[PDB]
Each structure stands twice: as C-alpha cells, then as structure tokens.
C-alpha cells in the first residue's frame, strides 16, 4: 500500500519564563514512533512504538543530537522571526516545521515534504519539485533568499529521496506485524430518539487502523450527504480510532437508512441496519 | 495573529461497560496558539494523574492532544472534560456520554 | 530517521 513519514516540530516562546519550549514527534502513518520534549528530565528522543526499540545506542544518540540542534536553532529562528515582522519581544510566538515523505507499493518517492508556519499561518514551504520555494510573505522572501543562496533545497532533496524513503521502508519491514496490519472497523447502529415524529440513527465505526475511513448514510440508496452529522475521526489511545455518522430520521422510516462502511482492513464494504 | 477554539470530544476506549475497567478520553483539537488547559472530572471533580500526549499538528497546523486516565463507569458517576484556552471567555464544559 | 538541520530562516 502506500505509506508516510513525517517529523513534526514545535518551538513555543515564553518571554520571562526561560528559553521556548521544544517538542518533536516522528510518525509512520498514523503511528508515533518516536519523541522529544525540551523540558523532559534529561532530554533524549525516546521511542514510542515496539519496532524502533530495536535500534541501537547509535541511532538514539545522533536522533537526540539532532533534536538538541533543531531545538537551538528554533531558538535562534525565533528571535529572527521577530526582527522580520517588527514585533516585540513581550508575546509568546510559536514556530513549526514538518518534512518528511510519501512512498507507494513499491516503496518509491511519491512527493517529499519540508514546510514552516510561524505563528500558526505558511511561512515558506518546499515545492514539489524539491528544488524550488514558496514563500507566503516579503519576510518569508528574506528566508527564500538566503535558502536559495546556501541550496538548502538541494540538501533537502537529496534527504526526501534519499534516507526518508530508505528508513521509511526499513520501519515498515521492522513494523510489519502493525504498520502492514489495517485493522477493520468494529460496526452498529444505535437509535436516539428525539420526539414521538423522530430519531437519531448513529452508526458507529470502533477499532479501526488506519485512521483513514469512509462513513455515510443512505436512503433508499440516496445518498443523505448534507443530512449527516459527522464528528472528527478519534483517537481510541490503543493504537485504533473511532467515528460515528447520524442522521435524523422520521420515526417509523428506519428500515429506509442504509450505513455505508469503507475501510482497508475489511474484506468487502459494510451495508449496515439498525437492528432492533 | 489568527487564533482557533478547539474542537472538544470526550468518549472512553472501549464501549462503556459498568464495573469494567476502560478508559476516558478527551481529545483537543483545530485549536491555535498550542496553550490550553485540560481537566478531566468525576462528579465536577478533577481527577488526578491524567497523562497526555505530546504536542502534534494537522496538516493545516492546527493543533492536537489526547488527554486520558483509566476509569470504571458506573450508572451513577458523571465525567467531563473541562477545557481553557485564550479563545475561550470561560472554561468550556463537556459531559461524557456513552451515546457519542 | 531524521535530516540535521544546517540553516537559519
């Protein structure tokens, strides 16, 4: 199937409360894998899924090097920040960047990524090409100039293509028995009624990896898209996610609703019934 | 600055079960700048030793946290998630319930 | 794993 990475940073300033808080985590997937938090007792990038604990002394050591300058270097990347917006040093400002990169089956380069926001709003971004910049704003241009200068995007490049996508299919390998593994959604459907004229039809998706999931209700075949209530899919804290879909439906009409289910780990789409 | 109010779900692990051990989450979510202040409550009371994830973002960089404890429901007891955060003029309250 | 970072914005 296809797969990602992505490491995602964190830099938060805290004027007259020490140096900014820094925090970074690494993602196979939807899986997190491994973490750095600034503030941790004695900082070091610590594993977070079974298959990276297998990597030696080195590779903990360099990761945590590694942390430890991007966390200074967002120190300094601040303290620019300001100068290039003309702000003051009294507010709190936060920094982000995330890279990384998207293989398919065969484990080749889809699309590389390498992206800043400052303050919650694009600041410059990698382009696909991996060789060319955009920036959102003429301080953003200041940065864009001196990348262009140093051929940032080229160090970047050879990276994307490179050890991302390598180590990437070496995490899967290692990962197999759970990044390879699509567990499919747990199904129902519960009835809420409302008034004597109505209800409530809830189908649920419970336990499903990957994240990625298709819900929708249906009647007498018909779509009932704008009359879906759909909440955010969520994070179960066991590796697996959750999701529900409702639609108001006139009491005594529920045979007429049709749930429709789409996700990788089952072996054919769920047409789903309230049951009562 | 642009600034985002989270989005707020609160909901247990696995499907609630009386007198079975599970786990209640709240989940923080589209929310700009990453400052925020989550509780979990027992009857309007803060439970203590609740863990959390770490700081993450989507990929409209919109921030995310799973705040969770280990609980066992009962018919009786009420849980929520009480959330701050500087889009907020008062702290957000939301009830756990076993239907969403 | 990750890329070490030789540049300032």
Redesign the interface.
């Known amino acids: 199937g296809s797969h990602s990475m992505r490491y995602?940073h964190?830099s938060?300033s805290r004027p007259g409360r020490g140096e900014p808080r820094f925090?970074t985590?690494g993602?196979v997937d939807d899986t997190?894998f491994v973490?750095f938090?600034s503030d941790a007792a004695s900082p070091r990038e610590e594993p977070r899924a079974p298959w990276i604990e297998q990597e030696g002394p080195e590779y903990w050591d360099r990761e945590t090097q590694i942390c430890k300058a991007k966390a200074q270097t967002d120190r300094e990347d601040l303290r620019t920040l300001l100068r290039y917006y003309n702000q003051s040093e009294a507010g709190?400002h936060?920094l982000?960047n995330?890279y990384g990169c998207d293989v398919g089956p065969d484990g080749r380069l889809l699309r590389g990524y390498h992206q800043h926001?400052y303050?919650?709003?694009?600041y410059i971004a990698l382009n696909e090409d991996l060789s060319s910049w955009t920036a959102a704003d003429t301080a953003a241009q200041i940065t864009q100039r001196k990348w262009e200068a140093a051929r940032v995007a080229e160090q970047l490049r050879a990276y994307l293509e490179g050890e991302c996508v390598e180590w990437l299919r070496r995490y899967l390998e290692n990962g197999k028995e759970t990044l390879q593994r699509a567990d499919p959604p747990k199904t129902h459907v519960?009835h809420?009624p409302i008034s004597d004229h109505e209800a409530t039809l809830?189908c649920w998706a419970?336990g499903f990896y990957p994240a990625e999931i298709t819900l929708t209700w249906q009647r007498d075949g018909e779509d009932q898209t704008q009359d879906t209530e759909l909440?955010?899919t969520?994070?179960?804290?066991?590796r697996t996610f959750?999701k529900?879909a409702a639609v108001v439906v006139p009491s005594g009409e529920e045979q007429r609703y049709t749930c429709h289910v789409q996700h990788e780990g089952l072996p054919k789409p769920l047409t789903l019934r309230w049951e009562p | 600055?642009?600034?985002?109010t989270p989005?707020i779900?609160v909901?247990s692990?696995?499907?609630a079960e009386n007198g079975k051990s599970n786990?209640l989450?709240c989940?923080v979510?589209?929310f700009?700048?990453?400052?925020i202040e989550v509780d979990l409550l027992k009857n309007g009371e803060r439970i203590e030793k609740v863990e959390h994830?770490?700081?993450?973002?989507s990929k409209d960089?919109?921030?995310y946290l799973?705040y969770?404890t280990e609980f066992t429901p009962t018919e009786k007891d009420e849980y929520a998630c009480r959330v701050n955060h500087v889009t907020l003029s008062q702290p957000k309250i939301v009830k756990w319930d076993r239907?969403? | 794993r990750r890329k070490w970072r030789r540049w300032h914005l």
């Open positions: 995602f964190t938060v925090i985590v993602y997190l973490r938090d709190s936060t982000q995330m926001a303050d919650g709003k694009d519960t809420h809830r419970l909440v955010e969520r994070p179960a804290g066991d959750q529900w | 600055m642009i600034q985002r989005k779900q909901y692990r696995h499907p786990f989450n989940y979510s589209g700009h700048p990453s400052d994830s770490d700081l993450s973002f960089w919109s921030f799973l969770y239907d969403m």
